[PDB]
Each structure stands twice: as structure tokens, then as C-alpha cells.
Design a protein around this ligand. Structure first.
Ligand SMILES: [Cl-]
Ligand SMILES: [Cl-]
Length: 129
């Protein structure tokens, strides 16, 4: 499913992401925008043989199991295909674990390069939240 901007912001807020570990909702919407263009079905393969999955492009080496990444840790304890559902609950629960592990949102390269230090509140402007 390809979310709308305000639609996605509302689903993320409902799932407890607004100000989670200090990160306002605009940050999470901005990161979803540049990681996946709001598409829950997005997948991207990396040179190390790992693959990123879903609206927040979560990586198979550490966080989920896709059956084809050697040395994978499956820290969110889910199949990576669960991260592609139109229901974003699995992605949000896993992202909560990722953002909590010490490096905050710098774990997402697109966020670091395209959202960090910008006016991220523009991503929720105009939405009925
Ligand atoms: Cl914000
Ligand atoms: Cl980038």
C-alpha cells in the first residue's frame, strides 16, 4: 500500500511514534518518505547480501529474518515479509527497538542525510492530527 502523507502521520501517531525517544512525528514521516516513498512493499538489496524491507527499510542482517542473510540476528524476531503488510504495526514495533539501541534515528541513512537538521514539522503541516 502507498500511504498518503497525512494518512501515514495519523497511523504512526496512533501507534505511539510521536515524540518516541524524543523524535517528533515529522522526523518519522520524513524518514518514511525518503526510505520508501511511503510504499509498504519497498525492498532494496545491499552489497553485503542483506536486504531492507518496508516503509522504513529495516535491514535483514540485524532486525528480521528473510532466510537468505548469513549471520542474521533477527532482533525483532519476525519474518521480513511481515514488514511489508499494509498494516504498519510490525514495522513500528521493530522501529521502536531500533531507535532505542543507542544511535537513535542515525540508523536510517536517508534520515541522517535528508531530514536531520531540516524543518521536519513541514511533513505534518496541514494534517488533521
Ligand atoms: Cl514534527
Ligand atoms: Cl541518503
Amino acid at each position: 500500500k502507498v500511504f498518503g502523507r497525512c494518512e501515514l502521520a495519523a497511523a504512526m501517531k496512533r501507534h505511539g511514534l510521536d515524540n518516541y525517544r524524543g523524535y517528533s512525528l515529522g522526523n518519522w514521516v520524513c524518514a518514511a518518505k525518503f526510505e520508501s516513498n511511503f510504499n509498504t512493499q519497498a525492498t532494496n538489496r545491499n552489497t553485503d547480501g542483506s536486504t531492507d524491507y518496508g516503509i522504513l527499510q529495516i535491514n535483514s542482517r540485524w532486525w528480521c529474518n528473510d532466510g537468505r542473510t548469513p549471520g542474521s540476528r533477527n532482533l525483532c524476531n519476525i519474518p521480513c515479509s511481515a514488514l511489508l503488510s499494509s498494516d504498519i504495526t510490525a514495522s513500528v514495533n521493530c522501529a521502536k527497538k531500533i531507535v532505542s539501541d543507542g544511535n537513535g534515528m542515525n540508523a536510517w541513512v536517508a534520515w541522517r542525510n535528508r531530514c536531520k537538521g531540516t524543518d521536519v514539522q513541514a511533513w505534518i503541516r496541514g494534517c488533521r492530527l
